[PDB]
Amino acid sequence: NDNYQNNYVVGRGTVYFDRFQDGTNRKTGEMYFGNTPEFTINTDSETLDHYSSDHGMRVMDASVLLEASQGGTFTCDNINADNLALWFLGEVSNTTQTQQTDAKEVFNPIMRGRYYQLGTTDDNPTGVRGVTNFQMVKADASIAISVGSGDITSIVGATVVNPAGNYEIDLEAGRIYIEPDSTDLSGNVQIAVQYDVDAQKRTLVIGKSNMVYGALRMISDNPVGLNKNYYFPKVSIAPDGDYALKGDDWQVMSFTFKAMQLNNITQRVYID
Amino acid sequence: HGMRVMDASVLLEASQGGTFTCDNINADNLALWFLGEVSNTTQTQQTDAKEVFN
Amino acid sequence: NDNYQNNYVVGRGTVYFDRFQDGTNRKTGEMYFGNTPEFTINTDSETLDHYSSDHGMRVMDASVLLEASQGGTFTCDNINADNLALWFLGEVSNTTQTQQTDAKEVFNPIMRGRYYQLGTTDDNPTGVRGVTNFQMVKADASIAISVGSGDITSIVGATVVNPAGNYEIDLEAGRIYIEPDSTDLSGNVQIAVQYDVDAQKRTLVIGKSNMVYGALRMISDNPVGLNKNYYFPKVSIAPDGDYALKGDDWQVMSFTFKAMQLNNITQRVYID
Amino acid sequence: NDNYQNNYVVGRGTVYFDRFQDGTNRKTGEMYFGNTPEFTINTDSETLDHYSSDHGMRVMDASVLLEASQGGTFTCDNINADNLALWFLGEVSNTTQTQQTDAKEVFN
Amino acid sequence: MISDNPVGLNKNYYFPKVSIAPDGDYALKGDDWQVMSFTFKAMQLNNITQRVYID
Amino acid sequence: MISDNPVGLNKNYYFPKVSIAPDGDYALKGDDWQVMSFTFKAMQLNNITQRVYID
Amino acid sequence: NDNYQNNYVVGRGTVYFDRFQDGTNRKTGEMYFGNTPEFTINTDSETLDHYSSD
């Protein structure tokens, strides 16, 4: 016997991650998640045994371990554009928009009392932010309108719509709200518009569907225990659970992973 | 070599979806919840409408 | 943007129901349930999609809705003879009993300390209520007794039983309780009785097994919101859950339904 | 419309039971359980419908009720020799023992 | 979902094609206020535009 | 078979001569609802009109 | 290559039949069966080939 000294620990540490290039195993640089409120490591280990058939009832002659899937789940509270690329399995795209003038667009079916987004194209699919000079005219819905060139006040069947009591626009997002009580836009009426687009740098997170491989690392600085840090040479980050946007608590993103093996030499988990 | 060594893995599907509630109850949201359609009609002003309950 | 005004609502309203005649679709008149403490409408909607097999892994090319079963459950607190006909899947029977005299009945096996019901016939199967003049005699159980006519004090093997210390009768229900310590009725002893039946109108709820079709309607008068009322042209009322008779809370009857479709024109749900 | 009067109820009552003779349907006398603290009646009713196959997706053309099993559970607090015959599925036997002397027995 | 967050750097979501379906139950009478639980499932519009666009 | 398909571009079939024969069994009593399984075999009416016409 | 649009289908339809008079080929009027829960079309096609012997 002896007077023994245990190693109690409270876990506090940062979690790092570096993606691999697509279809290869080259690093790209470890990113910083943020404050991860939990970081668990679980193991599902099924076995396989053989009960002997020479004496006794169900005597275990030999057993062996089939698999031991090293994995775990974690959440994170820092929400930037970079972690949403991992949760939505997508990629950050830092683009701009072209400063164009006289951008013309048609809305053929119209119910009044409905929002409308200006400029849903293939270049900027989520919309156009920044509108300088807005003008629109109305027409009957049974007439097909060709706005291939020229102004819209000069085309046939056009009637200029007053800006008061008929619609309402904000210029920081380019959103048209047709009024629910607008006598000029009642009936079966279509609308052709024009607007001017500014130029600013904007960020999209285009959420495709591909599994993201990479290495995981938790450097820990424990406040009461002898600290130690973990390293996973290859995991596969997948989204887990739900991502509740609105509520009372603060928004967390629950992740999960599954530690694979990089090659025939380097193994799955390295505790330093 | 080995017992259950993961040589390669891949993602079959990733179903992006979600649920939400709403508290504003008008005639327009009930068309979405009941999978139906709003019908704004009238009734004909008729007189001497006769009906039997057997 | 705008200053928007929501439509908040607290639901309070009455629930109506009219049965159909058996094997047809004719109405009979909407009954009033009572205060229904809850009335829910749920929808189980399974879908069917087809993942594309030309590019990508599990890309949804097209999806469609197989079924959308409009249905719901509700409870009710008003317990009369009319709602028990719906919960027990039966039918209210408003009958009478025939005012007869000298009604004679035999009880061949007798354990003492047991209740006995007078007049379990095919006309009034639950019993006979209202007894005027009760007399009974005892005999040995090995002797078959024929009480086809005449009084019972004059038949063979008869011994008149004293009313004190041997049995006990209430006349409002016609129930015989043989005393647990009665020396006159100990052993293997049978009993033949006589009694007189009064005449009063009585109500039974004969609980058969048939599905009850009908239309459902909830006219609502909401105390804080813009009210609106529902109408189901054909549902099928079925009993749901349990009906706890004794306890602390007040007795509720949980129902359920499943909105069918009346014909090829009228659909399943009409919100006004 | 009207001023309606509901029928609210708190359930308190006694529960009676009379056995049948074995293999027959003859009564024997209703016994008294005691204070039964609960007495519920539940119904498990599965149905059978036929979705039409001429127009639409899963349009209920006709439905019908297969079974409606009327049943229930209850407890009881009075424990005598008579209710234990029902719970243990047995039978009360009121016997005696023979007054004998010099009863000899071995425990090996 | 255009969001105007009271404490964080706000951002808005866009789904090019979903399929709104009713979910859960719609309790009419009770104590709390009536809510309608919906659900959706983000499909893909064509071979170019993908399922989710965070701006 | 005139078809009115709920999700696809509908089309209808026409067989100028078949021979209806009973097939399988016709279970009278049971749990499911009684169905009658038929079968046929598309013959040819003459030397001009063929066996199957999809419109 | 292109952005192709398939033709997916769920089959729902009615099945009609008109008898012939006995020993002839004259029509008599198409009857309505009812809801037919399935309607399959199968083809048994045996072939005949000749393996070369040169």
PDB file of N, CA, C and O in Angstrom, chain C residues 189-237:
ATOM      1  N   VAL C 189     -77.821 -25.829  -0.881  1.00  0.00           N
ATOM      2  CA  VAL C 189     -79.222 -25.427  -0.813  1.00  0.00           C
ATOM      3  C   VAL C 189     -79.528 -24.518  -1.995  1.00  0.00           C
ATOM      4  O   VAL C 189     -78.778 -23.575  -2.268  1.00  0.00           O
ATOM      5  N   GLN C 190     -80.622 -24.806  -2.697  1.00  0.00           N
ATOM      6  CA  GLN C 190     -81.131 -23.954  -3.761  1.00  0.00           C
ATOM      7  C   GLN C 190     -82.340 -23.152  -3.280  1.00  0.00           C
ATOM      8  O   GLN C 190     -82.915 -23.412  -2.222  1.00  0.00           O
ATOM      9  N   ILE C 191     -82.715 -22.158  -4.083  1.00  0.00           N
ATOM     10  CA  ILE C 191     -83.702 -21.145  -3.713  1.00  0.00           C
ATOM     11  C   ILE C 191     -84.598 -20.859  -4.912  1.00  0.00           C
ATOM     12  O   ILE C 191     -84.105 -20.641  -6.024  1.00  0.00           O
ATOM     13  N   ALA C 192     -85.914 -20.871  -4.689  1.00  0.00           N
ATOM     14  CA  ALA C 192     -86.890 -20.367  -5.644  1.00  0.00           C
ATOM     15  C   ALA C 192     -87.586 -19.150  -5.051  1.00  0.00           C
ATOM     16  O   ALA C 192     -87.927 -19.140  -3.865  1.00  0.00           O
ATOM     17  N   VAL C 193     -87.805 -18.126  -5.877  1.00  0.00           N
ATOM     18  CA  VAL C 193     -88.270 -16.826  -5.411  1.00  0.00           C
ATOM     19  C   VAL C 193     -89.589 -16.474  -6.089  1.00  0.00           C
ATOM     20  O   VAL C 193     -90.043 -17.146  -7.016  1.00  0.00           O
ATOM     21  N   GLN C 194     -90.202 -15.395  -5.605  1.00  0.00           N
ATOM     22  CA  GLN C 194     -91.249 -14.690  -6.330  1.00  0.00           C
ATOM     23  C   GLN C 194     -91.150 -13.204  -6.024  1.00  0.00           C
ATOM     24  O   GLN C 194     -90.694 -12.804  -4.950  1.00  0.00           O
ATOM     25  N   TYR C 195     -91.587 -12.394  -6.983  1.00  0.00           N
ATOM     26  CA  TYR C 195     -91.504 -10.945  -6.874  1.00  0.00           C
ATOM     27  C   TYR C 195     -92.475 -10.319  -7.863  1.00  0.00           C
ATOM     28  O   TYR C 195     -92.968 -10.981  -8.781  1.00  0.00           O
ATOM     29  N   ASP C 196     -92.744  -9.034  -7.658  1.00  0.00           N
ATOM     30  CA  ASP C 196     -93.656  -8.271  -8.497  1.00  0.00           C
ATOM     31  C   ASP C 196     -92.904  -7.102  -9.116  1.00  0.00           C
ATOM     32  O   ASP C 196     -92.189  -6.378  -8.416  1.00  0.00           O
ATOM     33  N   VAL C 197     -93.073  -6.917 -10.421  1.00  0.00           N
ATOM     34  CA  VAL C 197     -92.310  -5.941 -11.188  1.00  0.00           C
ATOM     35  C   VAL C 197     -93.198  -4.737 -11.467  1.00  0.00           C
ATOM     36  O   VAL C 197     -94.353  -4.890 -11.883  1.00  0.00           O
ATOM     37  N   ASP C 198     -92.664  -3.538 -11.241  1.00  0.00           N
ATOM     38  CA  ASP C 198     -93.369  -2.302 -11.554  1.00  0.00           C
ATOM     39  C   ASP C 198     -93.211  -1.979 -13.041  1.00  0.00           C
ATOM     40  O   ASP C 198     -92.746  -2.797 -13.837  1.00  0.00           O
ATOM     41  N   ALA C 199     -93.599  -0.769 -13.436  1.00  0.00           N
ATOM     42  CA  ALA C 199     -93.491  -0.342 -14.826  1.00  0.00           C
ATOM     43  C   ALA C 199     -92.961   1.081 -14.868  1.00  0.00           C
ATOM     44  O   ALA C 199     -93.607   1.999 -14.355  1.00  0.00           O
ATOM     45  N   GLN C 200     -91.790   1.261 -15.476  1.00  0.00           N
ATOM     46  CA  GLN C 200     -91.230   2.589 -15.672  1.00  0.00           C
ATOM     47  C   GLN C 200     -90.381   2.589 -16.932  1.00  0.00           C
ATOM     48  O   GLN C 200     -89.887   1.546 -17.372  1.00  0.00           O
ATOM     49  N   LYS C 201     -90.231   3.773 -17.519  1.00  0.00           N
ATOM     50  CA  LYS C 201     -89.390   3.925 -18.698  1.00  0.00           C
ATOM     51  C   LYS C 201     -87.923   3.870 -18.297  1.00  0.00           C
ATOM     52  O   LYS C 201     -87.505   4.524 -17.337  1.00  0.00           O
ATOM     53  N   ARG C 202     -87.139   3.083 -19.030  1.00  0.00           N
ATOM     54  CA  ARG C 202     -85.734   2.893 -18.711  1.00  0.00           C
ATOM     55  C   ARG C 202     -84.916   2.932 -19.993  1.00  0.00           C
ATOM     56  O   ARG C 202     -85.423   2.682 -21.088  1.00  0.00           O
ATOM     57  N   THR C 203     -83.635   3.254 -19.843  1.00  0.00           N
ATOM     58  CA  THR C 203     -82.758   3.498 -20.977  1.00  0.00           C
ATOM     59  C   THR C 203     -81.556   2.571 -20.902  1.00  0.00           C
ATOM     60  O   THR C 203     -80.866   2.528 -19.880  1.00  0.00           O
ATOM     61  N   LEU C 204     -81.313   1.834 -21.979  1.00  0.00           N
ATOM     62  CA  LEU C 204     -80.113   1.029 -22.124  1.00  0.00           C
ATOM     63  C   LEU C 204     -79.277   1.547 -23.286  1.00  0.00           C
ATOM     64  O   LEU C 204     -79.789   2.162 -24.224  1.00  0.00           O
ATOM     65  N   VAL C 205     -77.979   1.293 -23.209  1.00  0.00           N
ATOM     66  CA  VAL C 205     -77.046   1.597 -24.292  1.00  0.00           C
ATOM     67  C   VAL C 205     -76.439   0.261 -24.700  1.00  0.00           C
ATOM     68  O   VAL C 205     -75.464  -0.217 -24.112  1.00  0.00           O
ATOM     69  N   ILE C 206     -77.036  -0.371 -25.704  1.00  0.00           N
ATOM     70  CA  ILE C 206     -76.644  -1.714 -26.117  1.00  0.00           C
ATOM     71  C   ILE C 206     -75.437  -1.585 -27.040  1.00  0.00           C
ATOM     72  O   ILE C 206     -75.564  -1.165 -28.191  1.00  0.00           O
ATOM     73  N   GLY C 207     -74.264  -1.952 -26.534  1.00  0.00           N
ATOM     74  CA  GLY C 207     -73.004  -1.703 -27.209  1.00  0.00           C
ATOM     75  C   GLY C 207     -72.577  -2.709 -28.258  1.00  0.00           C
ATOM     76  O   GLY C 207     -71.733  -3.567 -27.984  1.00  0.00           O
ATOM     77  N   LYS C 208     -73.137  -2.619 -29.461  1.00  0.00           N
ATOM     78  CA  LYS C 208     -72.762  -3.508 -30.555  1.00  0.00           C
ATOM     79  C   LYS C 208     -71.424  -3.080 -31.162  1.00  0.00           C
ATOM     80  O   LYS C 208     -70.713  -2.220 -30.637  1.00  0.00           O
ATOM     81  N   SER C 209     -71.055  -3.695 -32.285  1.00  0.00           N
ATOM     82  CA  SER C 209     -69.772  -3.438 -32.941  1.00  0.00           C
ATOM     83  C   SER C 209     -70.024  -3.065 -34.398  1.00  0.00           C
ATOM     84  O   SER C 209     -70.125  -3.939 -35.263  1.00  0.00           O
ATOM     85  N   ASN C 210     -70.125  -1.765 -34.666  1.00  0.00           N
ATOM     86  CA  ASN C 210     -70.216  -1.264 -36.028  1.00  0.00           C
ATOM     87  C   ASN C 210     -69.602   0.127 -36.102  1.00  0.00           C
ATOM     88  O   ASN C 210     -69.707   0.916 -35.159  1.00  0.00           O
ATOM     89  N   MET C 211     -68.936   0.412 -37.216  1.00  0.00           N
ATOM     90  CA  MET C 211     -68.303   1.708 -37.402  1.00  0.00           C
ATOM     91  C   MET C 211     -69.356   2.762 -37.716  1.00  0.00           C
ATOM     92  O   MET C 211     -70.244   2.547 -38.545  1.00  0.00           O
ATOM     93  N   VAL C 212     -69.256   3.901 -37.041  1.00  0.00           N
ATOM     94  CA  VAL C 212     -70.215   4.987 -37.179  1.00  0.00           C
ATOM     95  C   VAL C 212     -69.607   6.053 -38.076  1.00  0.00           C
ATOM     96  O   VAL C 212     -68.582   6.653 -37.733  1.00  0.00           O
ATOM     97  N   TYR C 213     -70.236   6.293 -39.219  1.00  0.00           N
ATOM     98  CA  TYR C 213     -69.828   7.351 -40.126  1.00  0.00           C
ATOM     99  C   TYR C 213     -70.615   8.615 -39.816  1.00  0.00           C
ATOM    100  O   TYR C 213     -71.636   8.578 -39.129  1.00  0.00           O
ATOM    101  N   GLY C 214     -70.130   9.735 -40.331  1.00  0.00           N
ATOM    102  CA  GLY C 214     -70.832  10.986 -40.127  1.00  0.00           C
ATOM    103  C   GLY C 214     -69.944  12.158 -40.468  1.00  0.00           C
ATOM    104  O   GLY C 214     -68.777  11.998 -40.836  1.00  0.00           O
ATOM    105  N   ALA C 215     -70.519  13.347 -40.335  1.00  0.00           N
ATOM    106  CA  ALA C 215     -69.829  14.591 -40.634  1.00  0.00           C
ATOM    107  C   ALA C 215     -69.487  15.323 -39.343  1.00  0.00           C
ATOM    108  O   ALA C 215     -70.238  15.279 -38.367  1.00  0.00           O
ATOM    109  N   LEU C 216     -68.347  16.004 -39.346  1.00  0.00           N
ATOM    110  CA  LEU C 216     -67.837  16.670 -38.159  1.00  0.00           C
ATOM    111  C   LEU C 216     -67.710  18.162 -38.434  1.00  0.00           C
ATOM    112  O   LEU C 216     -67.382  18.577 -39.548  1.00  0.00           O
ATOM    113  N   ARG C 217     -67.978  18.967 -37.409  1.00  0.00           N
ATOM    114  CA  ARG C 217     -68.003  20.416 -37.549  1.00  0.00           C
ATOM    115  C   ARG C 217     -67.618  21.050 -36.224  1.00  0.00           C
ATOM    116  O   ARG C 217     -68.144  20.657 -35.180  1.00  0.00           O
ATOM    117  N   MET C 218     -66.708  22.021 -36.261  1.00  0.00           N
ATOM    118  CA  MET C 218     -66.326  22.768 -35.066  1.00  0.00           C
ATOM    119  C   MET C 218     -66.569  24.253 -35.310  1.00  0.00           C
ATOM    120  O   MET C 218     -65.719  24.940 -35.877  1.00  0.00           O
ATOM    121  N   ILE C 219     -67.718  24.755 -34.871  1.00  0.00           N
ATOM    122  CA  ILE C 219     -67.952  26.195 -34.856  1.00  0.00           C
ATOM    123  C   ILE C 219     -67.236  26.790 -33.653  1.00  0.00           C
ATOM    124  O   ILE C 219     -67.491  26.399 -32.510  1.00  0.00           O
ATOM    125  N   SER C 220     -66.339  27.738 -33.907  1.00  0.00           N
ATOM    126  CA  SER C 220     -65.498  28.323 -32.874  1.00  0.00           C
ATOM    127  C   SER C 220     -65.847  29.790 -32.670  1.00  0.00           C
ATOM    128  O   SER C 220     -66.128  30.512 -33.630  1.00  0.00           O
ATOM    129  N   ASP C 221     -65.826  30.220 -31.409  1.00  0.00           N
ATOM    130  CA  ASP C 221     -66.003  31.620 -31.025  1.00  0.00           C
ATOM    131  C   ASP C 221     -64.802  32.014 -30.165  1.00  0.00           C
ATOM    132  O   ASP C 221     -64.833  31.957 -28.932  1.00  0.00           O
ATOM    133  N   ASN C 222     -63.734  32.428 -30.829  1.00  0.00           N
ATOM    134  CA  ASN C 222     -62.454  32.603 -30.162  1.00  0.00           C
ATOM    135  C   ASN C 222     -62.438  33.906 -29.365  1.00  0.00           C
ATOM    136  O   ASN C 222     -62.911  34.938 -29.849  1.00  0.00           O
ATOM    137  N   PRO C 223     -61.903  33.881 -28.140  1.00  0.00           N
ATOM    138  CA  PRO C 223     -61.973  35.072 -27.283  1.00  0.00           C
ATOM    139  C   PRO C 223     -60.938  36.138 -27.592  1.00  0.00           C
ATOM    140  O   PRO C 223     -61.100  37.274 -27.129  1.00  0.00           O
ATOM    141  N   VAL C 224     -59.883  35.824 -28.341  1.00  0.00           N
ATOM    142  CA  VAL C 224     -58.857  36.821 -28.633  1.00  0.00           C
ATOM    143  C   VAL C 224     -58.518  36.914 -30.115  1.00  0.00           C
ATOM    144  O   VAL C 224     -57.941  37.926 -30.555  1.00  0.00           O
ATOM    145  N   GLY C 225     -58.884  35.941 -30.948  1.00  0.00           N
ATOM    146  CA  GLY C 225     -58.494  35.929 -32.338  1.00  0.00           C
ATOM    147  C   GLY C 225     -59.672  36.020 -33.292  1.00  0.00           C
ATOM    148  O   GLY C 225     -60.837  35.943 -32.911  1.00  0.00           O
ATOM    149  N   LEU C 226     -59.330  36.196 -34.565  1.00  0.00           N
ATOM    150  CA  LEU C 226     -60.322  36.186 -35.631  1.00  0.00           C
ATOM    151  C   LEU C 226     -60.817  34.759 -35.820  1.00  0.00           C
ATOM    152  O   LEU C 226     -60.062  33.886 -36.258  1.00  0.00           O
ATOM    153  N   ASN C 227     -62.079  34.517 -35.486  1.00  0.00           N
ATOM    154  CA  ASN C 227     -62.588  33.159 -35.409  1.00  0.00           C
ATOM    155  C   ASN C 227     -62.885  32.586 -36.792  1.00  0.00           C
ATOM    156  O   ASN C 227     -63.088  33.310 -37.770  1.00  0.00           O
ATOM    157  N   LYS C 228     -62.908  31.257 -36.852  1.00  0.00           N
ATOM    158  CA  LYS C 228     -63.144  30.510 -38.078  1.00  0.00           C
ATOM    159  C   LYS C 228     -63.568  29.101 -37.698  1.00  0.00           C
ATOM    160  O   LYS C 228     -63.208  28.601 -36.629  1.00  0.00           O
ATOM    161  N   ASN C 229     -64.347  28.471 -38.571  1.00  0.00           N
ATOM    162  CA  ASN C 229     -64.960  27.189 -38.264  1.00  0.00           C
ATOM    163  C   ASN C 229     -64.652  26.156 -39.336  1.00  0.00           C
ATOM    164  O   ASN C 229     -64.475  26.482 -40.512  1.00  0.00           O
ATOM    165  N   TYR C 230     -64.595  24.901 -38.907  1.00  0.00           N
ATOM    166  CA  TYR C 230     -64.158  23.777 -39.717  1.00  0.00           C
ATOM    167  C   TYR C 230     -65.349  22.894 -40.063  1.00  0.00           C
ATOM    168  O   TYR C 230     -66.366  22.888 -39.367  1.00  0.00           O
ATOM    169  N   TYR C 231     -65.212  22.135 -41.146  1.00  0.00           N
ATOM    170  CA  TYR C 231     -66.267  21.211 -41.537  1.00  0.00           C
ATOM    171  C   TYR C 231     -65.667  20.026 -42.272  1.00  0.00           C
ATOM    172  O   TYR C 231     -64.960  20.199 -43.268  1.00  0.00           O
ATOM    173  N   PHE C 232     -65.956  18.830 -41.770  1.00  0.00           N
ATOM    174  CA  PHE C 232     -65.504  17.582 -42.360  1.00  0.00           C
ATOM    175  C   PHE C 232     -66.716  16.867 -42.931  1.00  0.00           C
ATOM    176  O   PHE C 232     -67.618  16.522 -42.158  1.00  0.00           O
ATOM    177  N   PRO C 233     -66.807  16.644 -44.244  1.00  0.00           N
ATOM    178  CA  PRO C 233     -68.036  16.048 -44.794  1.00  0.00           C
ATOM    179  C   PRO C 233     -68.238  14.584 -44.439  1.00  0.00           C
ATOM    180  O   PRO C 233     -69.391  14.145 -44.345  1.00  0.00           O
ATOM    181  N   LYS C 234     -67.173  13.811 -44.237  1.00  0.00           N
ATOM    182  CA  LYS C 234     -67.325  12.432 -43.782  1.00  0.00           C
ATOM    183  C   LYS C 234     -66.117  12.028 -42.955  1.00  0.00           C
ATOM    184  O   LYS C 234     -64.990  12.047 -43.455  1.00  0.00           O
ATOM    185  N   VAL C 235     -66.357  11.659 -41.698  1.00  0.00           N
ATOM    186  CA  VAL C 235     -65.336  11.053 -40.852  1.00  0.00           C
ATOM    187  C   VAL C 235     -65.846   9.707 -40.365  1.00  0.00           C
ATOM    188  O   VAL C 235     -66.950   9.285 -40.718  1.00  0.00           O
ATOM    189  N   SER C 236     -65.043   9.023 -39.554  1.00  0.00           N
ATOM    190  CA  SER C 236     -65.431   7.743 -38.963  1.00  0.00           C
ATOM    191  C   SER C 236     -65.009   7.773 -37.499  1.00  0.00           C
ATOM    192  O   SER C 236     -63.827   7.601 -37.187  1.00  0.00           O
ATOM    193  N   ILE C 237     -65.975   7.996 -36.608  1.00  0.00           N
ATOM    194  CA  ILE C 237     -65.679   8.114 -35.186  1.00  0.00           C
ATOM    195  C   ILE C 237     -65.361   6.742 -34.608  1.00  0.00           C
ATOM    196  O   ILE C 237     -66.144   5.794 -34.744  1.00  0.00           O
TER     197      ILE C 237
END
